[PDB]
Write an enzyme that holds these catalytic residues in place. Structure first.
Site, PDB file in Angstrom:
ATOM      1  N   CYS A 181      62.864   5.039  38.246  1.00 53.03           N
ATOM      2  CA  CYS A 181      62.577   5.155  39.670  1.00 53.03           C
ATOM      3  C   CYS A 181      62.724   3.795  40.348  1.00 53.03           C
ATOM      4  CB  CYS A 181      61.151   5.685  39.850  1.00 53.03           C
ATOM      5  SG  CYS A 181      60.661   5.993  41.550  1.00 53.03           S
ATOM      6  N   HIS A 214      61.842  15.594  40.537  1.00 53.12           N
ATOM      7  CA  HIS A 214      61.401  14.205  40.560  1.00 53.12           C
ATOM      8  C   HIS A 214      61.196  13.771  42.013  1.00 53.12           C
ATOM      9  CE1 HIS A 214      61.616   9.871  39.132  1.00 53.12           C
ATOM     10  NE2 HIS A 214      61.785   9.747  40.436  1.00 53.12           N
ATOM     11  N   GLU A 215      62.159  14.097  42.873  1.00 58.95           N
ATOM     12  CA  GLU A 215      62.071  13.726  44.280  1.00 58.95           C
ATOM     13  C   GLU A 215      60.961  14.467  45.017  1.00 58.95           C
ATOM     14  OE1 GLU A 215      63.275  11.119  45.264  1.00 58.95           O
ATOM     15  OE2 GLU A 215      64.477  10.902  43.448  1.00 58.95           O
ATOM     16  N   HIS A 248      57.609  13.018  44.503  1.00 57.74           N
ATOM     17  CA  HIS A 248      57.305  11.882  45.367  1.00 57.74           C
ATOM     18  C   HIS A 248      56.575  12.299  46.634  1.00 57.74           C
ATOM     19  CE1 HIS A 248      58.824   8.319  43.501  1.00 57.74           C
ATOM     20  NE2 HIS A 248      60.049   8.790  43.359  1.00 57.74           N
TER      21      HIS A 248
HETATM   22 ZN   LIG Z   1      61.811   8.135  42.063  1.00 53.85          ZN
END
Ligand SMILES: [Zn+2]
Length: 184
Positions: free
Chosen positions: A111, A154-155, A158
């Site tokens: 990341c 994954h995004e 966030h």
């Molecule tokens: Zn990331």
């Protein structure tokens, strides 16, 4: 243009908050931001440009990463030789359904908001269906599998204040879950 100095790092409170839902239509500023986020990915993937501005190559970016607590993400996965590529700017993305079977990248994940590498498998859903709006407020529904499914999860993580390393097992970080798909 956005550069590494715009990317906030692990420890910044905004990375742990829950991003706010976007009201449609997006404002001019929000659109310019989302376009800039994608442009950042484009530049990060260009060897010459990335070198010139010291950019770390990546295929996904979430608004919280540039200190904007809004549910917007940009994903730019280049052709995997399979002819499949993913170029999406999503607003209010949400996983509506997913497989029970999991998947994981053999070398773990990385990341831009985490300066140092972290070893450990990150198990996610192998298949997911996402519903979102695009930059103009129109509807998008994606059916993803494997690598791209992992990138989008994954995004989206966030947007909920979740970092990839939160999924890594402390005692056995490299031990794959039984029946989980090793994404090649
Ligand atoms: Zn990331």
């Amino acid at each position: 243009m956005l550069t590494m100095k715009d990317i906030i790092r692990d420890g910044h409170p905004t990375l742990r908050q829950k991003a706010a839902e976007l009201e449609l239509p997006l404002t001019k500023e929000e659109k310019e931001t989302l376009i800039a986020m994608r442009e950042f990915l484009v530049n990060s993937q260009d060897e010459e440009i990335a070198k010139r501005y010291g950019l770390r190559s990546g295929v996904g970016l979430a608004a919280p990463q540039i200190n904007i607590s809004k549910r917007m993400i940009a994903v730019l996965i280049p052709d995997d030789g399979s002819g499949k590529s993913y170029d999406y700017m999503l607003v209010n993305p949400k996983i509506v359904s997913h497989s029970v079977q999991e998947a994981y990248l053999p070398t773990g994940e990385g990341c831009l908001s985490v300066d140092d590498n972290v070893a450990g498998l990150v198990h996610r859903h192998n298949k997911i269906t996402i519903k979102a709006k695009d930059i103009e407020g129109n509807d998008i529904q994606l059916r993803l599998k494997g690598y791209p499914a992992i990138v989008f999860q994954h995004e989206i993580d966030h947007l909920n204040g979740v970092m990839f390393y939160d999924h890594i097992d402390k005692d056995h970080p490299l031990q794959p879950h039984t029946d989980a798909v090793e994404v090649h």
